[PDB]
Symmetry: C4
Subunit: 454 residues, 4 copies
């Protein structure tokens, strides 16, 4: 009788009450504090390594734009184009000539890689004739390359085909050595820059945009942190073991209560009792455990095998650290102790969540109105997604006088879309500022009263 | 006695309670779910058709600006003008010369349409003489055209009349073929671009702005969705039939109660009883029915007859989809069941709506103060409507440091409008942020308490 | 006994109750409705007259900038300067040469006014010698003019004195005729443009800014609204008579109650009874009366005598219309009737107003901290007033990422102002968003509960 | 018995009640009012002295940029660079040639200081060879100067070493005389401008940025306020004496109560009684005392010894004035009198402060997610601090449509970071606008109810 009662009472005993009664079982909570310190120190010490890499890439791409592009100002990337015929010839010829004299010009020690390959791509047999609308078009793509070697009569006399042109692309490589890595007490890693100038002509609209994308391949030239990540996986795995034993002990006393409620037979106490046995935090911490050790094993594999995709490793570690810090709030809820602190998902959280569904639908309806009506006349409403970004910017207010001014400029001079757009925007702003934010305050205040005073 | 009572009770029976008692009358609610899916799939599949058209127009207008306008940078449309005399001559002569050599320049396959017509418009007899203020002006407009044919001594030697000039306009057509429509598994539609360069001289202020408007006419050259819109009109019309029978059955039991309250004679129960009989949602859904089928019949007529005005069809379909999604909230109010959920328009909604009138008037008064006082000194307050956009931007905060800086620049150096403008703007911001948003929260919270706890 | 009681009861009788009992005393309330219509129609019909004038001025100033200034792009007014020596000579010589050939260049019919007067202003005897710090300076200003007549050897060979130069100013006039005023069914008013180019050298810092201010003088060349303003002053004056009789009748029954409370002798009922006798709205309406008729008499005097100062007339009419529209709320408070609706200034309004004093002081303290500390390092914090505009923009959020970026750029590289500026800005934003807006909601909600439920 | 009781009652007696009973003890409160006036008049009269200095510096730096830098537009400081080889030579040679003819060019009376010293800094023995990855690098820095004297064959023929270059710096001085200080009734202070042009090549990335920093040294050439600061330190020190006696008298009656509660022996009344004896404001005012007199003694020392570091003096005075104005609120709490008005730090302030900890952690977790994941692809997320500025700007809404557009531009075209970034940003905006601001309102309203109605 007595032993079965106190095991439940020891189970829901707060650890601050449990230290002042039992005395010194420290090894559980200490490694949670160690986990927060060790994971964030790994994340910061990795993040500075990326920033030292990335800005060395970002300055080199800009220095390639001022060298290989013709007439490139700064901050005008997307509206950079070649409209006439001679501008396309001049933008090709200037890009090659700046390659063949590159050691006599640039300032970083750029070396060649043994070369440059110009290549255009036109249709197999295209005949566009707008006087008779005759087309006889195989959409088969025939790529016609041309080679240029650096230390010409072969390079010039080039004939583009402006009536079936798809792409004019230039591809080459460059190798450079980081010299910042002298003082940083490391072996300077040699980089390989792979450049692909693109003269895109997909839309065939008499406007060819131009862009220049780079790509790196970091390789060591002609042991601290390697120990540190082993520290992280051992620390985090011991938490994965120990918390799993805590939850299955929670299942042990989950079933131990119910069997005792058959000899008593208290009407087979429902699902809202067995759910009151487990926890509200250890599932969050153990989900952080699996995410952390998965990202770190991927991080160990990268820096020996290949260093290209710092992408899935980044999206896993950045979520693991988020779950750790949000997992610290438990320490600030030992002071609270309302006796389950999980019935909020029965009581208060449903009445805010179906309101969140009601807000989500009305917001979706104004998306589907704005994208079709104010699509062809306005510049910021092309895709459905950019409509979603523009209306969600209008809620808090970021982009709001620019859209009324752009609406005021012409808007067709139809004076029906404009009378629609005033009635559209004023209603949508005045709805989600006043009659939605205020309902949301009334719901959360009703929740907080319902949790506290009962 | 019993049959008349239960017909009322079956009427207000919720459908989730009605399935668990009666059993399987599914055909009503199912087509509402089908309606939401079918209307939104029509709207999305139409909207992508517009975006593939519109961006092909928008790139071609920009490529016409870089070809036919002199000295056109990008993003400087409105402050593009010709101030001297030679700039107006050079902007005309350059626009014609780029037309007569257009196949040797541009990149899209632009073909002529058999031509270019330059034409100026000056007054019949105007004599402006500022030394004696003598005017003898017939405002009769005499248009003097001139023809130019492309494959000149006729084109040059042109004499403008800068003392009675109204407009110098150039009009011509261009025909091109979309070549993007090869891979999209369709017949490539040939377009016809109609260009109208405008040298406007309306205000006679020594500043002539320049702009270039295009206009398209899409025509097929030398059956999926056509079935799909027939699916929409049949689906939506069956809802228009079936919901109308539901509401007139609502009128049937509207009158059936009142006649039974004459044999009882319960003091001839008032308008707030017969209004409690109908609904709060089927009028919204049937208004979506009429709007949907009207827009679709207009959409069928467009793609065979003429394709110019995608304007009223767009403004009807974009409203119909809005009413559908806002009409989904009924499914989230079966869980609620407060026994009419329409008396809010008697109880709670009036006490927010007359407050909304009180906010609307004060906002209108600050419009009429700002437009006359801060009109002549500030750039953003010309019309009354742009004042309305500027103050409504200042409420949420979008344009707020720019207007104080523009106020700080000169503001006449009268130092009376500036002392007014500080007292104007600070009071208007501090009113509608604090003492209006907070009253609105107190009203909605009082509404939600009044609906719930009584 | 009975007659003295009902005169009080008729006094506080609402007019909607007073029509349904007494019957048809309409002439009081009708002219209030007439007042709202007539004043706003005057204000709108005057405001369109200003906008037709002002944009004709604003385009002519821009067309003067492109003609008389050297190398003027658009939207770069304040950072337009002449730094070297030859740039100051070239900006003078170009401005005069464009004046002497002005009818052969510009497009509006600009005529001369019989002329141009160049004039510089230098000190009487200034000797600046930085090798010995010797100054012997009379600050007496000696103006040296030079005349130029238009249809030169006299104009050139000009010698500026760059070691004691204060101002180089050019002044002349231009006359033009509005030709837009043909179709507008009026007599076209001839304008006189007075231009003053300024080469300011006040700060002696090796940077001379340049600006060009115009000034107009509208005069008729070689009766609807005149009646309409007489309609306004007669309408508004009859309200000034009739409401004054209403308030002095309010003083009549103010004293009639108190004398009857000496025969009763109800302990000499206090100031919060005699204040409950008058009103809360007629003082607002009669203040709108005096402001309206004052501005209109000034408006009559302007359009015959001189048309320069549309400034005090504008600041009076724009306030009168504001008081009228805010004065409409009384019609929406007949429905309310809480029996004085002025004791809010005893009950609820003091407890928000001393909180408004407490917010006003803390805001003032952060002004005096920011202007001295973040003054010399940051560009937006020069005056105290521009600090007030910048912090008040940071409250609602308009200018907030720009100031952190400007703080991040250098900020001295002292790393003490930066550590101060992070702690400054984060505390000031987080205070007035959370812990002030929320107290203000709690005060207004406490006010609304106190007014309603007691 | 009686004397011990009334000393406590006189202690908590409000001064407005204390004047109407005792009568005229004015000297305490009067100097607090004098303190507010005297400190703010010192602060304003000092702040205008800084602004007259700083704008004379800020215009001279800009006028040095247009003279000594090649091809400098305005507002383009950070993206000003030299990418090729000839641009670095031309930017050096142009900067020196504009120095050797400086009195024949500039407008302010700039004089030389007897000179210019060009000097480059390259590595001791560097060999970068990307064909074999051979490096043999001493990172020892060998500075190679070159002298130029102004009134050349020595200046030209300069050989940079582009393969081991670190810095190319030019240093010289200029002396000028303020001439604005004639009319300001003072002795004109001669300034010394020290200029350091920097051609930084730290990252070795083929992109050399260019910047020009100045530095002043104000010295008088060949008594009002000096008295005024002595007034401030004497005023503020008398407050430091008098308030200290008030607090130690507070300790005197702190111990006088407790000894009387041993003869009574009221169970040794706890820490929440002895804390109710002192104050809540005099510690704030005396902290303002020490800060004020410290900053002023530093201010006296500056204007005789050296005038460089107006930095710690500014950061102390700007905090002292803040504490004074926030210290005025006590006058508005004599009207209040809730009988301690400090138990809020026991009652209400803890339940908002641990919520402020819970908000602070979640905000920190989204920092550590955003900086690693959205680091390499986005321009505004480089450091951790600029992530903190960007997310805190997104809360109130300042930078919100720019970040979605920059996310929409490429974002790698990996379509996994983009699907992450939508889910990242939408959750973070919707959390701290709705479900945090509303909890904060519910906490402050619960605080205000708890303070008032109990
Ligand atoms: C230039 O256009 C060609 C098509 O003419 C592109 O080649 C295709 O690219 C897509 C995506 O990489 C592939 O799915 C196709 O298989 C490619 N087809 C052929 C025949 O190569 C080419 O990628 C374009 N250039 C760039 C830089 O995008
Ligand atoms: C150029 O000015 C002429 C007037 O001189 C405009 O012609 C008028 O245009 C309006 C609107 O289209 C019509 O209501 C009038 O009937 C037209 N009058 C004549 C005589 O044609 C012309 O439209 C202007 N050009 C442009 C491009 O707007
Ligand atoms: C150019 O500088 C002169 C001073 O050298 C200015 O003349 C003074 O202007 C102020 C304000 O108008 C008057 O209070 C003084 O009496 C004027 N003094 C003299 C001697 O004229 C002149 O105004 C400046 N030019 C401009 C356009 O502001
Ligand atoms: C140019 O580069 C040199 C290094 O080659 C810089 O000199 C160092 O500057 C730092 C910071 O001032 C000192 O800690 C080092 O002791 C300096 N080393 C030497 C050898 O001087 C120099 O400061 C750079 N120029 C500028 C303007 O920053
Ligand atoms: Na902005």
């Amino acid at each position: 009788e007595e032993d079965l009662r106190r095991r439940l009472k020891y189970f829901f005993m707060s650890p601050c009450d449990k230290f002042r009664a039992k005395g010194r079982k420290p090894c559980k909570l200490m490694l949670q504090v160690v986990k927060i310190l060790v994971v964030t120190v790994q994340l910061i010490l990795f993040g500075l390594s990326n920033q030292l890499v990335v800005t060395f890439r970002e300055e080199n791409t800009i220095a390639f734009r001022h060298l290989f592009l013709l007439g490139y100002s700064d901050g005008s990337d997307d509206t950079f184009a070649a409209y006439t015929q001679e501008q396309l010839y001049q933008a090709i010829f200037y890009a090659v000539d700046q390659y063949l004299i590159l050691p006599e010009i640039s300032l970083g020690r750029y070396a060649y890689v043994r070369a440059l390959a110009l290549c255009q791509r036109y249709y197999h047999r295209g005949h566009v004739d707008p006087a008779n609308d005759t087309f006889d078009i195989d959409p088969r793509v025939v790529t016609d390359c041309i080679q240029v070697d650096p230390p010409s009569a072969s390079y010039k006399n080039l004939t583009l085909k402006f009536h079936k042109l798809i792409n004019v692309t230039i591809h080459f490589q460059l190798k450079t050595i980081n010299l910042q890595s002298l003082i940083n007490n490391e072996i300077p890693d040699c980089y390989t820059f792979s450049i692909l100038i693109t003269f895109d002509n997909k839309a065939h609209s008499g406007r060819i945009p131009i862009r220049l994308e780079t790509k790196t391949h970091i390789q060591e030239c002609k042991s601290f942190r390697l120990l540190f990540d082993v520290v992280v996986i051992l620390t985090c795995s011991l938490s994965f073991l120990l918390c799993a034993r805590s939850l299955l002990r929670g299942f042990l006393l989950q079933n131990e209560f119910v069997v005792f409620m058959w000899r008593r037979r208290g009407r087979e106490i429902s699902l809202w009792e067995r759910l009151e046995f487990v926890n509200g935090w250890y599932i969050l911490l153990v989900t952080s455990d699996v995410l952390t050790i998965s990202g770190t094993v991927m991080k160990i594999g990268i820096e020996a095998k290949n260093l290209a995709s710092y992408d899935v490793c980044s999206i896993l570690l950045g979520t693991s650290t988020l779950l750790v810090w949000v997992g610290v709030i438990r320490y600030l809820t030992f002071f609270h102790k309302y006796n389950i602190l999980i019935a909020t998902l029965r009581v208060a959280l449903p009445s805010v969540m179906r309101f969140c569904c009601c807000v989500a639908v009305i917001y979706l309806g104004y998306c589907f109105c704005g994208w079709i009506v104010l699509g062809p006349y306005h510049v910021k409403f092309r895709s459905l997604s950019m409509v979603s970004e523009c209306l969600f910017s209008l809620i808090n207010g970021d982009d709001m006088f620019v859209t009324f001014a752009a609406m005021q400029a012409q808007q067709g001079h139809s004076s029906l879309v404009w009378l629609f757009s005033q009635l559209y925007l004023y209603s949508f702003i005045s709805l989600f500022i006043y009659m939605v934010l205020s309902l949301f305050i009334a719901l959360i205040t009703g929740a907080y009263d319902t949790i506290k005073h009962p």
